[PDB]
Amino acid sequence: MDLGGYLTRIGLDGRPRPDLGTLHAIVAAHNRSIPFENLDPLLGIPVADLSAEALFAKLVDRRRGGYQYEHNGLLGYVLEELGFEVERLSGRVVWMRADDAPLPAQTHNVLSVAVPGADGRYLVDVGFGGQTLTSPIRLEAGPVQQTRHEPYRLTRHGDDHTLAAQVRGEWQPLYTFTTEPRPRIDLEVGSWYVSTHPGSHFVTGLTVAVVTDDARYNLRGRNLAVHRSGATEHIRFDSAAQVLDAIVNRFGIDLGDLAGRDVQARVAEVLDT
Amino acid sequence: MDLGGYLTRIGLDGRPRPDLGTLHAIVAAHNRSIPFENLDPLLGIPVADLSAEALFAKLVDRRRGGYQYEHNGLLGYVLEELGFEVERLSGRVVWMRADDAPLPAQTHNVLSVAVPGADGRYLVDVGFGGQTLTSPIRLEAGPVQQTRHEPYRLTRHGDDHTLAAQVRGEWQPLYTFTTEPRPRIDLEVGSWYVSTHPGSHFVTGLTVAVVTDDARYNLRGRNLAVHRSGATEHIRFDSAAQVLDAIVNRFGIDLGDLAGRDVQARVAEVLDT
Incomplete structure (x- = not known):
């Protein structure tokens, strides 16, 4: 290319x-x-x-x-x-949505990236706009992970992951996604x-x-x-x-x-x- | 000095x-x-x-x-x-005050300046803060006067003058004053x-x-x-x-x-x- x-x-x-x-x-x-x-x-x-x-x-x-x-x-x-080995994932944007809001459409696309020497996978997302991830992070639920800017965190219920960002001292869910590769x-x-x-x-x-x-x-x-x-x-x-x-x-x-x-x-x- | x-x-x-x-x-x-x-x-x-x-x-x-x-x-x-020849004037701040607001205290101080060889006097006010006059203007009631920034205008009812500024397209009275020199x-x-x-x-x-x-x-x-x-x-x-x-x-x-x-x-x- x-x-x-x-x-x-x-x-x-x-x-x-x-x-x-x-x-x-x-x-x-x-x-x-x-x-x-x-x-x-x-x-x-x-x-x-x-x-x-x-x-x-x-x-x-x-x-x-x-x-x-x-x-x-x-x-x-x-x-x-x-x-790199790359899978394309889809997700649903939950940013600033009410706790009881209807399920959003799948409107987001992110990457799950592996280095040839398999140390797990990384979430990569340069497409979310102003609040997009500014580092790759480990695609691993649980830990707070530092980036070039604010801390971010993945959590999961089964394969439903949520990415959140600590925005001005307040944690804010951004989107949910599964790890099913998408065509x-x-x-x-x-x-x-x-x-x-x-x-x-x-x-x-x-x-x-x-x-x-x-x-x-x-x-x-x-x-x-x-x-x-x-x-x-x-x-x-x-x-x-x-x-x-x-x-x-x-x-x-x-x-x-x-x-x-x-x-x-x-x-x-x-x-x- | x-x-x-x-x-x-x-x-x-x-x-x-x-x-x-x-x-x-x-x-x-x-x-x-x-x-x-x-x-x-x-x-x-x-x-x-x-x-x-x-x-x-x-x-x-x-x-x-x-x-x-x-x-x-x-x-x-x-x-x-x-x-220059300088008289110190006092005034009352009316910025954003309702029409039926009680009379404000005299809390402002401005200058009336005579320039040798030039007619009349000039209003000089470098102390009003963010919206302060950025040019001297003629101390003359009536005409819209240009400044380094927005137009300003003095008007008079009796001996009470009002200075107004055209702030983002809207005329805003700033303060009133009389020309009585103050000790x-x-x-x-x-x-x-x-x-x-x-x-x-x-x-x-x-x-x-x-x-x-x-x-x-x-x-x-x-x-x-x-x-x-x-x-x-x-x-x-x-x-x-x-x-x-x-x-x-x-x-x-x-x-x-x-x-x-x-x-x-x-x-x-x-x-x-």
């Missing part, structure tokens, strides 16, 4: 080896280089094709970001090519739903995110949240133009890709959704 | 001539260089002495900021020494009230502010608001430690003269007040 293109995109060079050190370095570089964004579903463009060709073309060659299926799909292919088509059916259902969070508004060594950035509509050590920031943009400026210059997304779609007018509709 | 310390403090040099250009330059330099702060009243230290000796020693020599009486007190002495003692009585009454805004919590060319900054307790072109920001500090960090490193306040008074514990008490 075009790993050279991917490695350049994320600010690495040369062929890295399939070891744990490389896994950490790639996750960190991906985190800071390729943003989470849902401009395609926002603009009525489905995310239907999760092939390597499609994902490299968009997230690497066209300097766009993507959402969960695009991020982890891409990284899945990259890690495989490099020599690409089942991920594509999920992605069709998330990118086209008129009630989908990723159809009804705009989410853009990126994570640097120092901070998590998460834009929803006009509202940019920043979580840094010791402080939160909330930046409220006045209008769609400022949002578009942030998209291009803060988040590094080329909107030339979306010529003739009236991005600015659609962003205006979702400032507060 | 040595003015060299003051001029260095605000990032100017030499001896500027008492003209309109100098008045604009000094206001702008003061705005960015000496912050609004009420650390003394917060810590039970009254602001009682508005002599040149007291105000220069604190706001210049000790690299502290100050509140309304200290700012406009200091600038009044500076402007007189340079060859220092009457200002000191006001400052005694503002710095010692247990219900005073400047006794019950922490207020720090500064204004740069690009933004207005206003901190209350743990909450920093920023108004800039196209956006507002709200930064929430985790604890007093980060607030003190901001006081020293962002606002440039030397806390050395407060050694031995446990500034951090007092700030901790008022993060949410």
Whole structure:
């Protein structure tokens, strides 16, 4: 594949080896280089094709970001090519959901990754957005595990795992998942739903995110949240133009890709959704 | 009156001539260089002495900021020494007060400045905090006047003037005042009230502010608001430690003269007040 293109995109060079050190370095570089964004579903463009060709073309060659299926799909292919053993998993997002809420749809995709020298498996997820994992963690229920940012924890009931993050001193469940490997088509059916259902969070508004060594950035509509050590920031943009400026210059997304779609007018509709 | 310390403090040099250009330059330099702060009243230290000796020693020599009486007190002495003619005025703060609110106390102090060779007088106020005037304006009721930032406007009913600012598109009355010149003692009585009454805004919590060319900054307790072109920001500090960090490193306040008074514990008490 075009790993050279991917490695350049994320600010690495040369062929890295399939070891744990490389896994950490790639996750960190991906985190800071390729943003989470849902401009395609926002603009009525489905995310239907999760092939390597499609994902490299968009997230690497066209300097766009993507959402969960695009991020982890891409990284899945990259890690495989490099020599890691990769299974694609699906999950249900429970973030900020009430204790008694209906069961969510399977709308997430994460990776279970092994190094050739079988020291168990690692959860890898660079596609959850602003609160995405910034390190690989051991796919092992029980222990609190440190990362490049906040502590995270896996717990399980049978094969139903829950990933939680310690967000500003408070533990928050993010999503649940099983370890049953999923074929690409089942991920594509999920992605069709998330990118086209008129009630989908990723159809009804705009989410853009990126994570640097120092901070998590998460834009929803006009509202940019920043979580840094010791402080939160909330930046409220006045209008769609400022949002578009942030998209291009803060988040590094080329909107030339979306010529003739009236991005600015659609962003205006979702400032507060 | 040595003015060299003051001029260095605000990032100017030499001896500027008492003209309109100098008045604009000094206001702008003061705005960015000496912050609004009420650390003394917060810590039970009254602001009682508005002599040149007291105000220069604190706001210049000790690299502290100050509140309304200290700012406009200091600038009044500076402007007189340079060859301007200065009257000190008092006023009542009406910002965000209901139409049927009781009459406020006289808690503000502003300057009416005559520039040699120029008609009329100029309102100068570098002590109102985050929304303080960033240009001198003509002390003339009626016309909308441009500043380095937003438009401001004086209006008059009898001898009571109202200063208003167009804040993010909305006209907001800030304070009322008369043009009766005030003796220092009457200002000191006001400052005694503002710095010692247990219900005073400047006794019950922490207020720090500064204004740069690009933004207005206003901190209350743990909450920093920023108004800039196209956006507002709200930064929430985790604890007093980060607030003190901001006081020293962002606002440039030397806390050395407060050694031995446990500034951090007092700030901790008022993060949410």
